[PDB]
Amino acid sequence: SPYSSDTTPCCFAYIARPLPRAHIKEYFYTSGKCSNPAVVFVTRKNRQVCANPEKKWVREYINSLEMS
Amino acid sequence: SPYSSDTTPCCFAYIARPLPRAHIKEYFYTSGKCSNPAVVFVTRKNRQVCANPEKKWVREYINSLEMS
């Protein structure tokens, strides 16, 4: 992008415990304007969380999110 | 902080036009886990925007936000 005036979702920490996919409205990755590329889950309570794609349940949710 | 698993509001761009303080629920600064320290306004539509403190209306809103 050329220019965007909006806060960027940069995640640096990672959660060890998994989250309730049921309460996980949607998620998304983040990088470029950050220190490292990581994932970000979002529940219905506008709650954002940082998760690494090197986990066993993390990639399980992303794959269970974008199905056919 | 020791460790926090949450996306950080890092702003790098800046808006030239001012915003409607009336629709500006609240704002906050951002830095540390970012490239540069900047301000961030938030309207009732959970809309976040990046604003520099070197403007004429920006510091006007922050000062008009935290009054006595």
Structure-block tokens of residue B25: 């629920």
- The range of the structural domain enclosing residue A19 comes to 1-68
Give the Cα separation of A64 and A14 in Å (integer). 20
Determine contact, residues B52/B38, Cβ cutoff 8 Å. Answer: yes
Q: Which of residues 22-61 of B touch A (CB under 8 A)?
A: 30, 33-35, 40, 46, 48-51
Selecting from B3, B7, B13 the residue whose C-beta is nearest the C-beta of A11 gives: B7
Give the Cα separation of B48 and B11 in Å (integer). 10
Experimental method: NMR
**Residue B37's domain is classified under what CATH number?**
2.40.50.40
Give the Cα separation of B51 and B20 in Å (integer). 13
Largest CA distance in chain A: 37
Give the Cα separation of B38 and A24 in Å (integer). 30
String of DSSP letters for B1-68: -----S-EEE-----SS---GGG--EEEEE-SSSSS-EEEEE-TTS-EEEE-TTSSSHHHHHHHHS--
For chain A, the domain total comes to 1
Q: B21 — phi, psi (to 5°)?
A: -50, -30
A–B interface: beta-carbon pairs under 8 A: 60
- Distances in Å between the alpha carbon of A39 and those of A32, A59, B55, B56, B63? 13, 10, 34, 37, 36
